[PDB]
């Protein structure tokens, strides 16, 4: 069955969110460096 598939996709999705988040953070650090100069 495609039961576990759903669970996997959820986990991937959550991780991807984690990424998107860290990426936003890093965009902040970059905009900070640029604004600093």
């Amino acid at each position: 069955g495609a039961s576990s598939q759903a669970a996997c996709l959820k986990q991937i999705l959550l991780l991807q969110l984690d990424l998107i988040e860290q990426q936003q953070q890093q965009l902040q650090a970059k905009e900070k460096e640029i604004e600093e100069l």
Partner: protein, 115 residues
């Protein structure tokens, strides 16, 4: 200037949804409380509707967004935003459109976990 508020709210909502044990009351109400704000951040300031073609001001960090069919038209939040005023600050912010789609699909999934 990327849609910071909207992405943040998306992360919140998405998380609550994907960590919700369908049936459980607390997470559910938390979702229901949080969701309109995420919806609000993706609403056109002239329509009230969900951005049908997102245009963001290259102008400012003020984060007010409109449909493409909502150029030069009267915005709703009174007092009006100072930074918004200049209208030729048209940019098709992709991140916005994506987030709009994201929200739609999220609602779809939610209604599924509800029914």
């Amino acid at each position: 200037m990327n849609p910071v508020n909207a992405t943040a709210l998306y992360i919140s909502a998405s998380r609550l949804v994907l960590n919700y044990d369908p049936g459980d009351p607390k997470a559910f109400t938390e979702i229901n409380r949080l969701l309109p704000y995420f919806r609000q951040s993706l609403s056109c300031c002239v329509c009230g509707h969900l951005l049908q073609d997102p245009i963001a001001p290259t102008n400012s960090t003020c984060q007010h967004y409109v449909c493409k069919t909502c150029k030069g038209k009267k915005m709703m939040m009174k007092p009006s935003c100072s930074w918004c005023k200049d209208y030729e600050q048209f940019e098709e912010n992709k991140q916005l459109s994506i987030l709009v789609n994201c929200y739609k699909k999220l609602c779809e999934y939610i209604t599924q976990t509800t029914l």
